[PDB]
Write a protein that binds this DNA or RNA. Structure first.
Ligand SMILES: *C(=O)[C@H](CCSC)NC=O
Ligand SMILES: [Mg+2]
Ligand SMILES: [Mg+2]
Ligand SMILES: [Mg+2]
Ligand SMILES: [Mg+2]
Ligand SMILES: [Mg+2]
Ligand SMILES: [Mg+2]
Ligand SMILES: [Mg+2]
Ligand SMILES: [Mg+2]
Ligand SMILES: [Mg+2]
Ligand SMILES: [Mg+2]
Ligand SMILES: [Mg+2]
Ligand SMILES: [Mg+2]
Ligand SMILES: [Mg+2]
Ligand SMILES: [Mg+2]
Ligand SMILES: [Mg+2]
Ligand SMILES: [Mg+2]
Ligand SMILES: [Mg+2]
Ligand SMILES: [Mg+2]
Ligand SMILES: [Mg+2]
Ligand SMILES: [Mg+2]
Ligand SMILES: [Mg+2]
Ligand SMILES: [Mg+2]
Ligand SMILES: [Mg+2]
Ligand SMILES: [Mg+2]
Ligand SMILES: [Mg+2]
Ligand SMILES: [Mg+2]
Ligand SMILES: [Mg+2]
Ligand SMILES: [Mg+2]
Ligand SMILES: [Mg+2]
Ligand SMILES: [Mg+2]
Ligand SMILES: [Mg+2]
Ligand SMILES: [Mg+2]
Ligand SMILES: [Mg+2]
Ligand SMILES: [Mg+2]
Ligand SMILES: [Mg+2]
Ligand SMILES: [Mg+2]
Ligand SMILES: [Mg+2]
Ligand SMILES: [Mg+2]
Ligand SMILES: [Mg+2]
Ligand SMILES: [Mg+2]
Ligand SMILES: [Mg+2]
Ligand SMILES: [Mg+2]
Ligand SMILES: [Mg+2]
Ligand SMILES: [Mg+2]
Ligand SMILES: [Mg+2]
Ligand SMILES: [Mg+2]
Ligand SMILES: [Mg+2]
Ligand SMILES: [Mg+2]
Ligand SMILES: [Mg+2]
Ligand SMILES: [Mg+2]
Ligand SMILES: [Mg+2]
Ligand SMILES: [Mg+2]
Ligand SMILES: [Mg+2]
Ligand SMILES: [Mg+2]
Ligand SMILES: [Mg+2]
Ligand SMILES: [Mg+2]
Ligand SMILES: [Mg+2]
Ligand SMILES: [Mg+2]
Ligand SMILES: [Mg+2]
Ligand SMILES: [Mg+2]
Ligand SMILES: [Mg+2]
Ligand SMILES: [Mg+2]
Ligand SMILES: [Mg+2]
Ligand SMILES: [Mg+2]
Ligand SMILES: [Mg+2]
Ligand SMILES: [Mg+2]
Ligand SMILES: [Mg+2]
Ligand SMILES: [Mg+2]
Ligand SMILES: [Mg+2]
Ligand SMILES: [Mg+2]
Ligand SMILES: [Mg+2]
Ligand SMILES: [Mg+2]
Ligand SMILES: [Mg+2]
Ligand SMILES: [Mg+2]
Ligand SMILES: [Mg+2]
Ligand SMILES: [Mg+2]
Ligand SMILES: [Mg+2]
Ligand SMILES: [Mg+2]
Ligand SMILES: [Mg+2]
Ligand SMILES: [Mg+2]
Ligand SMILES: [Mg+2]
Ligand SMILES: [Mg+2]
Ligand SMILES: [Mg+2]
Ligand SMILES: [Mg+2]
Lengths: 56, 114, 209, 61, 123, 119
RNA sequence: AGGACCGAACCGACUAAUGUUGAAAAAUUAGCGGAUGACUUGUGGCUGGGGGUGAAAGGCCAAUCAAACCGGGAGAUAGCU
RNA sequence: CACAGGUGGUCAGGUAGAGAAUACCAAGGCGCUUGAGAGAACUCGGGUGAAGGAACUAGGCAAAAUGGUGCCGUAACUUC
RNA sequence: AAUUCCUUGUCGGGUAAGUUCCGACCUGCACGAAUGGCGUAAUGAUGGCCAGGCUGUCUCCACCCGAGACUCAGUGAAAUU
RNA sequence: GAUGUCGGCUCAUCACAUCCUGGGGCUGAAGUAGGUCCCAAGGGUAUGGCUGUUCGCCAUUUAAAGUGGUACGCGAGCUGGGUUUAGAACGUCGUGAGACAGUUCGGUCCCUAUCUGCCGUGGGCGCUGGAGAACUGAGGGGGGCUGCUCCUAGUACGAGAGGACCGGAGUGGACGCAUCACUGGUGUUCGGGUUGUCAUGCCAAUGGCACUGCCCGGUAGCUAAAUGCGGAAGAGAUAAGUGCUGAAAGCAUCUAAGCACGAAACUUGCCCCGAGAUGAGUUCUCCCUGACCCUUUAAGGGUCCUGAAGGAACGUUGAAGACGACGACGUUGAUAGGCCGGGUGUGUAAGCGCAGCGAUGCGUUGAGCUAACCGGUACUAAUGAACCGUGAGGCUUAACCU
């Protein structure tokens, strides 16, 4: 149910070893609008693989 | 699969008649005893038919000597010699399992004319 | 004796002329082809590495390609070894067929069992459930005790517990070979073999016999 | 162990005693006393008595 | 698929009407008895003047079951209810002189040959 | 386990799920494009496309069926009079998913789903 | 007619599983008993601590009861920790 | 505590119903202030289950079952 | 026997098998006559025992539907040491 | 300044003083079946009735229903019948409060796991250039039960009754593994019947809600009660035991020299894991063959170019899966959805027409609809890239090649 000894900070650190975030490897650049975006997602301006798929 | 289908089709009997549920059918089956294959008849109502090509089957119910008996025949088994529709019945269901809890005058199923 | 690498097509049945319906697993044993031959001199033991099926040219890696190329053979979906007995020779290019099984009566079939995922002890170890009612509190399918008191003061190794079930190599033995068919590259064996439909199956002549 | 009684000690200890004759198939239980030994003694006595009674019965018959 | 506590009907004319299976014989921990399997039974309901008497513990052979019997080709055969033929404990041969209702090929052997002969239908 | 089983449960009870698919499909039909969560969008493909297919053959029975499925006469009309003939040549694939980032309120991965001859 | 019967509201609280760092310092859901009476309920009033009240269980008397609570005697006394 | 609790009175629509029960609705009011996925074990709350049918268990606990109106019919015993 | 220690008394019933149950006997450790004796229809969320029906209670678990559990985002405790 | 108690349940694990199965000696061992002792712990080793029971008696099984240890194993795993509070009553003791290892009826069983442990499953680094595969097998785990029938043979044995060893064949029980072809279960994602009610203007037709409203069927999957397979044979070294030859001890003696047989135990054989086997192994294949500074001059640091093999990431995903992981595919494309065709399931849709006063019936019609199935099909989505990974790989000996 509960600890018998306060665990160390070292232990905590070790535990958190795997809690790190991975940044996006790289962003795709749209061919037409030249603006960066996530692979397989549309851009913020609304392009996807060159064509304008959405208004705003 | 295709291969499986091929395997199956070459085993299927081609002469199987057009019975439905309710039909009073008469299945003749091969019976070994000693060293003499003979042909035992099993006349009853078809209560359920299961269509799966080679794996096809049908459940014939009768009342042998007071006791009710269902028998499930594997349709394309060579142990069945001959299926034959002695009468054809008008039922509204694919399966006549309500006939298990019905006897005599209740278990009647009207004949399907035309 | 060596064995072949087939693929589980599916199950079906063979009605015998007598009456009996034999449940058969259908194994599509495409022409296996030798890629490499091992020996006591170089490798340290006698065996044959074989491949089977086709593979995508765009998907096969360079190293993989090279190995195949050296052999002088089409690239297949995998490579599998077979230990050779004394008095068994194979050239590198050679293609072994299901015709090899014509003489055998029984076979051991090996393949990866179906994955049941994380299984509890009722499924995985056939543990008896506890009482469904009569007072039971939150402990119907739970594993019960897992040890004794202060001695030994630990759970012993290989205690039966919940965990991953299936998706592992299993081997059914002494399966009767119902029919060999060189025409369609089929082997029919009586009874269910491991794995799902489309899974690879190493068929070998039965060691027990 | 004895029937019912009262405590932890009672629950654990095996004071009750059931003596049995292998030739005759007679039995004598005792769990009157706390002391196993005493019970045994009592039980033994009972058994002895029973044997005597059986011998007398036989004689009578 | 008869087990301890299962009430069967009687096929023979021994005297008994209703009998309860008290033991499936022929193996430790043996769960069920299907057709052709000998069971120990006790007579729960009997006729006024028969061979057997109520509360009589004796053997019986199971001749029909509701679960049924599978054949080599895979053709199952069932019945509407479970039944048995009473037998002597020692001699293992029927008490009655007359078997009612249909039985099966499963039953036929050197042991239960009388029964099959008696029976009106053998499926 | 769930080998070979189709159909997302979507942390909903069955009836509720059905309702939502009916609504969503209708909305899509109306607007020809909608922004929803990606899984939901995916699910919708197996409701809307079939409806579209049904709408190709204009019969009374078919119309009735459509109505039953959807229950908005307007939607049905749209399907039969516009989308059915509009997708007459097209053999499936009436719709298009485009992934569109993550919803602010709960980081739920969003996606547009749109009819293929929208623009 | 009825401390009659079946049954909602209302009053209760026999079984159950749940909860047991609760949604809750006693509840829940499913069933359960009474339901024109020795019923139930609102509002106001009266009984006070060896005192009350008690169809009586040492029950209840503000989440406190084999002698309430608050303040005081008071830093009681403690051969014990 | 923005707490599954407690809090007296009045109003009392429709269809079915004996009904203020119950079901579905009206007038009116709400979706209960974390969502999104996934579809392991195990827990909770439910559904179904071959054959058997209390063998479970301290105990049929729990479930299952019975369930309405009319008419026939209804034993011991009884303070009638 | 809500009372019997010896005691699972003995005999009978019920069950394939009954330390419980019912009927007897009386050998009442240690019943007994308003701290009432013996009966008793009716009533009981009362104790014990047996039967029919019914059943996942169980043989022996299987599948399914939802709420957690698991992963992502936001917020963010606790006993213990 | 707390170590929760009998029994039940669930899970066990060890000992051997062995209950069954295996091996053997002696027998007051003819045979069958026993008695007794020695070896042997591989596996196996009962369901019920009664009682809170452990125990035990009884019923019926079984090859056998072993005896013990483990906090008389196991309540941060369940129960709470017994015990061990408070209510009440009987007997009994007491003047009484009350009391009894007398009896009786009633009576709250908390804990989200830090560490060890164990079951699973990943990330990091390592294994000395990097990469993709296939292996070897140190070591570890699993498995190991047994009945009945028939033959041998009514032979051997025996006065008869009865009735074998050895060896062989079949078919079961229990347990385990796999699987879904069959028989079935489930199948709130398929079809249908049907009650009440609300809605779609109404009719007709549909949908919502009522536990999936209540039912009847049922596809895929998952599944057991379904059906395949398993336990071995063999080999080695032995146990008790049995010997052979053989002296010490002219004989005798299985032992001292030497040689042999000998069991479910041991080591192998069968199945699975397994090179973190840091003792980091082997085999095959693939990939990289450029500059110049710099100095604290060494397996040193830097900047331009360069970026392979392959990997990851992203996407479409899976009979893989908690998450990671593993597998498949990404247009040179069937990976998913859709679509087409089929199958399966349900059981003759709607609309129209005819018959009927009508409920309804008949025709069109085995119709319509049909999930997870099968075979096809690029219609939609799987993007051109980008990212990590480099640029021939230390020293010392030996042997070769030249
Ligand atoms: C024995 O006296 C005791 C229980 C008493 S309950 C008031 N057992 C151990 O602590
Ligand atoms: Mg401590
Ligand atoms: Mg973490
Ligand atoms: Mg899986
Ligand atoms: Mg159990
Ligand atoms: Mg609790
Ligand atoms: Mg529970
Ligand atoms: Mg799929
Ligand atoms: Mg959620
Ligand atoms: Mg609903
Ligand atoms: Mg009243
Ligand atoms: Mg009260
Ligand atoms: Mg309530
Ligand atoms: Mg009432
Ligand atoms: Mg008191
Ligand atoms: Mg008082
Ligand atoms: Mg108070
Ligand atoms: Mg006071
Ligand atoms: Mg005082
Ligand atoms: Mg003072
Ligand atoms: Mg002080
Ligand atoms: Mg709130
Ligand atoms: Mg509130
Ligand atoms: Mg109303
Ligand atoms: Mg209401
Ligand atoms: Mg909320
Ligand atoms: Mg779930
Ligand atoms: Mg149910
Ligand atoms: Mg059932
Ligand atoms: Mg049934
Ligand atoms: Mg019954
Ligand atoms: Mg019982
Ligand atoms: Mg029991
Ligand atoms: Mg109940
Ligand atoms: Mg119920
Ligand atoms: Mg007395
Ligand atoms: Mg007594
Ligand atoms: Mg008696
Ligand atoms: Mg009595
Ligand atoms: Mg008295
Ligand atoms: Mg007097
Ligand atoms: Mg008096
Ligand atoms: Mg009185
Ligand atoms: Mg009362
Ligand atoms: Mg804190
Ligand atoms: Mg302490
Ligand atoms: Mg020994
Ligand atoms: Mg001996
Ligand atoms: Mg061994
Ligand atoms: Mg009973
Ligand atoms: Mg009992
Ligand atoms: Mg009992
Ligand atoms: Mg203990
Ligand atoms: Mg413990
Ligand atoms: Mg305990
Ligand atoms: Mg607990
Ligand atoms: Mg503990
Ligand atoms: Mg108790
Ligand atoms: Mg008291
Ligand atoms: Mg005393
Ligand atoms: Mg109570
Ligand atoms: Mg309780
Ligand atoms: Mg690793
Ligand atoms: Mg080993
Ligand atoms: Mg199946
Ligand atoms: Mg299938
Ligand atoms: Mg079915
Ligand atoms: Mg169903
Ligand atoms: Mg199925
Ligand atoms: Mg309706
Ligand atoms: Mg209408
Ligand atoms: Mg509504
Ligand atoms: Mg000698
Ligand atoms: Mg000599
Ligand atoms: Mg000699
Ligand atoms: Mg040897
Ligand atoms: Mg390595
Ligand atoms: Mg193509
Ligand atoms: Mg069809
Ligand atoms: Mg319809
Ligand atoms: Mg029509
Ligand atoms: Mg007319
Ligand atoms: Mg017709
Ligand atoms: Mg179709
Ligand atoms: Mg396909």
């Amino acid at each position: 149910a509960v600890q018998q000894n306060k665990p160390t900070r070292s232990k905590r650190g070790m535990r958190r070893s795997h809690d790190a975030l991975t940044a996006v490897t790289s962003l795709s650049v749209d061919k037409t609008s030249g603006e960066k975006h996530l692979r397989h997602h549309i851009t913020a301006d609304g392009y996807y693989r060159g064509r304008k798929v959405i208004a705003k | 699969s295709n291969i499986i289908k091929q395997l199956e089709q070459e085993q299927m009997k081609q002469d199987v008649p057009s019975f439905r549920p309710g039909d009073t059918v008469e299945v003749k089956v091969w019976v070994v005893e000693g060293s003499k294959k003979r042909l035992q008849a099993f006349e009853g109502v078809v209560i359920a038919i299961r269509n799966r090509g080679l794996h096809s089957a049908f459940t014939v119910r009768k009342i042998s000597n007071g006791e009710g008996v269902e028998r499930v025949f594997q349709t394309h088994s060579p142990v069945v010699d001959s299926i034959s529709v002695k009468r054809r019945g008008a039922v509204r269901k694919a399966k006549l399992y309500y006939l298990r809890e019905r006897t005599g005058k209740a278990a009647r199923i009207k004949e399907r004319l035309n | 004796m060596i064995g072949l690498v087939g693929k589980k097509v599916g199950m079906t049945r063979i009605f015998t002329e007598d009456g009996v319906s034999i449940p058969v697993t259908v194994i599509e044993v495409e022409a296996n082809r030798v890629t490499q031959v091992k020996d006591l001199a170089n490798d340290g033991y006698r065996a044959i590495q074989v491949t089977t099926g086709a593979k995508k040219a765009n998907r096969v890696t360079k190293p993989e390609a090279g190995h195949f190329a050296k052999a002088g053979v089409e690239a297949g979906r995998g490579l599998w070894e077979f230990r050779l007995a004394e008095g068994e020779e194979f050239t590198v290019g050679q293609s072994i067929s299901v015709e090899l099984f014509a003489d055998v009566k029984k076979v051991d079939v090996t393949g990866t069992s179906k994955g049941k995922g994380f299984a509890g002890t009722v499924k995985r170890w056939n543990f008896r459930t506890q009482d469904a009612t009569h007072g039971n509190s939150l402990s119907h399918r739970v594993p019960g005790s897992i040890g004794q008191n202060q001695t030994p003061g630990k759970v012993f190794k290989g205690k039966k517990m919940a965990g991953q079930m299936g998706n592992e190599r299993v081997t059914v033995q002494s399966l009767d070979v119902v029919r060999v068919d060189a025409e369609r590259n089929l082997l029919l064996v009586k009874g269910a073999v491991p794995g799902a439909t489309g899974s690879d199956l190493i068929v070998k002549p039965a060691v027990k016999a | 162990r004895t029937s019912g009684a009262g405590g932890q000690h009672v629950n654990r200890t095996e004071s009750a005693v059931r003596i049995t004759h292998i030739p005759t198939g007679i039995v004598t239980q005792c769990q009157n006393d706390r002391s196993q030994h005493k019970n045994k003694d009592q039980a033994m006595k009972q058994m002895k008595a029973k044997l005597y009674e059986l011998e007398m019965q036989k004689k009578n018959a | 698929m008869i087990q301890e506590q299962t009430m069967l009907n009687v096929a023979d004319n021994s005297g008994a009407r209703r009998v309860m299976c008290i033991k499936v014989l022929g193996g430790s921990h043996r769960r069920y008895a299907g057709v052709g399997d000998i069971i120990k039974i006790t007579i729960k309901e009997a006729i006024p003047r028969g061979k057997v008497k109520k509360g009589d513990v004796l053997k019986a052979v199971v001749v029909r079951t509701k679960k049924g019997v599978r054949r080599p080709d895979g053709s199952v055969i069932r019945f509407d209810g479970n039944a048995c033929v009473l037998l002597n404990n020692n001699s293992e041969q029927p008490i009655g002189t007359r078997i009612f209702g249909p039985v099966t090929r499963e039953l036929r052997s050197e042991k239960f040959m009388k029964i099959i002969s008696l029976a009106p239908e053998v499926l | 386990m769930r080998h070979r089983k189709s159909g997302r449960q979507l942390n909903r009870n069955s009836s509720h799920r059905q309702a939502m698919f009916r609504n969503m499909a209708g909305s899509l039909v109306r607007h020809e494009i909608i922004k929803t969560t990606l899984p939901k969008a995916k699910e919708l493909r197996r409701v809307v496309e079939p409806l579209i297919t049904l709408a190709k053959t204009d019969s009374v029975a078919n119309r009735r069926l459509a109505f039953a499925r959807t229950r908005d006469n307007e939607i049905v009309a749209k399907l039969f009079n516009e989308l059915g003939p509009r997708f007459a040549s097209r053999a499936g694939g009436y719709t298009r998913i485009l992934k569109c980032g993550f919803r602010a309120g709960d980081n739920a991965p969003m996606a547009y789903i749109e009819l293929v001859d929208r623009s």
